Symmetry: D2
Subunit: 293 residues, 4 copies
């Protein structure tokens, strides 16, 4: 199984993508053992990016690696089609789309047609990005089978029964969990990995949990998983999407600029309180020789 980072998008003070800081971030992640980078996901504020900015993001990361899954979805299908087609020039793993978000009670037929339209035009394998909380609708294993053209799925529902059902109804499909808290479990139960937001800032930990579980050292894996869980929990106190910037600087030593408002940066008191919550975890991780001091 794999650890895939849904890579953060760093913005400048001028609310433009900071390509320099992004390439630095990407190259650290690859050097620390991340298998692939998922570009323009939730964690990368994808829905906050214009079609042109989704492409800009791909180009900056592609300078670093071609191990990219390129998220192109949106509420203007023509733009999503144009991004799928433009990805022909890039030798990447695949493209991806969440379900059309916002609109409630969309018909299954219209959801199916949306995804099939993207497969029709795609020059690469197509991955399902299933984020039911964010989009308001689930594309479960049966609808995924009906759509019939997904090479893989990232399932962000917190219920591994749901995630396992993709593999049961679609045995050739690659199946990942979007949970940071299930890295140990996914690796130990036969699924293909995790698209883990927390690997932005502790890629060392996410990869080590996975290695330990693969080696059937389930107890060590779980004790490290539980330390990772505490960081995730601390990241949610002030909003995880904003907190992920602060944590990546704290743990990895470089900065990722700003988020895009209304994903607002943490203020200096929140930054201090957050670091307070993870100070001790860092020291334990250095002690354990997972982080350089």
């Amino acid at each position: 199984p794999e650890i895939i980072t849904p890579i953060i998008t760093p913005f400048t003070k001028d609310n433009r993508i900071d390509k320099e800081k992004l390439k630095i971030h990407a190259e650290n992640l690859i050097r620390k053992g991340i298998d692939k980078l998922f570009v323009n996901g939730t964690t990368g504020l994808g829905p906050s990016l214009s079609p042109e900015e989704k492409l800009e993001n791909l180009k900056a990361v592609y300078d670093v690696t071609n191990k990219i899954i390129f998220q192109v979805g949106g509420l203007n299908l023509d733009d999503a089609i144009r991004l799928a087609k433009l990805s022909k020039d890039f030798d990447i793993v695949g493209i991806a789309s969440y379900a059309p978000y916002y609109y409630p009670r969309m018909s299954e037929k219209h959801l199916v047609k949306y995804f099939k339209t993207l497969c029709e035009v795609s020059p690469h394998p197509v991955y399902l990005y299933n984020v039911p909380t964010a989009t308001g609708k689930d594309i479960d294993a049966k609808v995924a089978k009906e759509i019939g053209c997904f090479t893989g799925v990232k399932d962000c529902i917190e219920n591994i029964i749901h995630t396992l059902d993709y593999k049961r109804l679609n045995p050739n499909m690659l199946v990942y969990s979007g949970s940071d808290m299930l890295i140990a479990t996914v690796a130990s139960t036969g699924l293909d990995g995790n698209v883990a937001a927390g690997s932005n800032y502790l890629p060392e930990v996410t990869v080590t949990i996975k290695k330990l579980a693969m080696e059937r050292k389930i107890d060590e894996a779980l004790k490290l998983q539980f330390l990772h869980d505490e960081v995730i929990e601390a990241s949610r106190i002030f909003g995880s999407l904003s907190s992920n910037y602060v944590l990546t600087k704290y743990f990895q030593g470089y900065d990722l600029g700003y988020p895009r408002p209304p994903i607002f940066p943490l203020d200096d008191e929140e930054e201090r309180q957050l670091i307070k919550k993870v100070e001790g975890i860092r020291a334990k991780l250095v002690e354990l020789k997972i982080l350089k001091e």
Copy 2:
């Protein structure tokens, strides 16, 4: 109380805003007694529109009437601020915004900051567009009071207790329901009206329910309201954002073009079945001298 139409955005076959159809539609609504038009709401596919298209809609409708509430929200706060400021040269009722959509578990502190930022740059009164199912989070009567700068709220939660709570904690706020099914009830219980998607295709019915209820002919109001309820239910079978187009053409005579994929247009069979579902109600409505032939 008032009926406010969250007006549909007609698109051309090539997925541009059809300004001529929009103006025809807006004038008909105004002529048929609709009080105000809510522009770039859910029903107008607001989240599907670029800032530039949101401005185009404002300009086209403003050519027809100044009785506009202008919805400007999105996931790029700079764009929302730019639209807010641009509205200064339009003599309209107000601006509005939904909460930042898509992203789950946003901090209340950031939600409050987002809305307060819009209030601070707004040259018109600001309305809260509370659509918790579409955006994933509620801005309830207490958070609204804490934001403190709303002139009104349109509440699309199906719970009239929630809606009355705005009036209770914010006595001077204008409070509307988003439910077509609660026109009779809203007008009877002291609320300020409904922002009703169904008034796109049956403005005569929505206005008439309101008037019957105001006249305290409650039995008459509910009878009409219940016929209007069945049209709403029919519109949901194939997807209501798409069906609203077919139903406007069917009941009002003129067509509104296409929606914007992935809100796909109803096919010929869906349209047949939808008309069959509402044929009877139409003849009933003409019998009652609510619709002409």
Copy 3:
């Protein structure tokens, strides 16, 4: 429209129904204009009562009034049939049942069959007691119509659209809301009334909200309704089902013994704090001549 009290069940110190306290409570409620009494409801801790105790409750209230709805349901259909048959010799308004509770995902077919069984043996009109949060399933206007034998429904779903749909699909059915917060609205919109727990301790308020709304004094109605809303909120702080005992003592003068554990009585600290939060509301209510000093 009517006000119906889901009457509290007083228990002694050794955990028996205090028949004498129950009769005093029922007498007061009737004296102050409560139309009917709903016996063995949620608020009376019906689920915590043996069939023998459900019968004792009925016999005690029956000494006071024939304006009784006798709730008989449970998870042993033989007991519910037996209670239904025993009611034959009581001059009462009707019996009622909630859906079988606890068990998730019961088939609709089994749900319908439970209620039709009770209708078949019942010597009185049968009322649907729709408490979906408490039971785990909803019996909506469509299933009610499918069952076909309900004389009325009490709808404790907080969504008045849902409630109105019972009238729309079942025009001859009596339709009550279970919310203390919709007395004004129910009375204004043509529904049949409220089954209001808070009428246990402020019958005078609930009766007065209704008359005001009936007299089309909606603004006075809402100002009183909003006062009542705050008492309801206060009662939730430590648990409404327990708090309901303290507030009856406080507003109406007599105590109602204890609840049945694990519905524990409020300790003395909680009781102090609860009273603190309604003191002001009491003051105003005396000031408005609704309560006696």
Copy 4:
């Protein structure tokens, strides 16, 4: 890890516990490799049982094994205290309780006092039976730690993150999942096993999945897990609690009498269709020598 059966309660045609058919069933399960028997759970219609019947069940099963967890909760704490004490003269693994069901919005204070009381009087280890869908409330890892007297937890929430949290916050605690679909996964990820309703009728399947997983043949475990999943899904078509009787007869030979209405027994055509749905699976389990011809 272990497999624990929440044992079905067989009823006679006149709705009394059929003690002899229970003993046959408990005997078969122990013979086929089940580790422990969970008595008076959901699957055994625990909540439909009076205190006397709950004890009847203990006694009958206790003639077969002492490997028993005795569920004793209900909505009268005195009855639950009495069953707990009565357990002193049986040499069993422990007693258990779900949270007080039906009543919504009970304070955490009162929930903690409910369980701590049971611990204060219990002569055996106390297990948490966490069934949030049935009771309407969750007793999560935090609340379970605050209570502080649980030897173990059975977690029926379908979210293994929530299940793992019990062990993270309570490392000495035995932690089971209530899901049949997570037998392979639970064993692979370091949890203590499954309380599986489906082991009533395919104990061979559930024990084998468990063994395959602890042998790190995850591929094989999952192939069998996925076959069992189809059976679980089949069982839900007509109501799983009633279908569990029909499937125990079909797969294991002996019948278990009747459920207790309103858990109604399947009718002849429902039994027909249910068998048609699990016919193929029975074959492949024979072909695999998991089931004898």
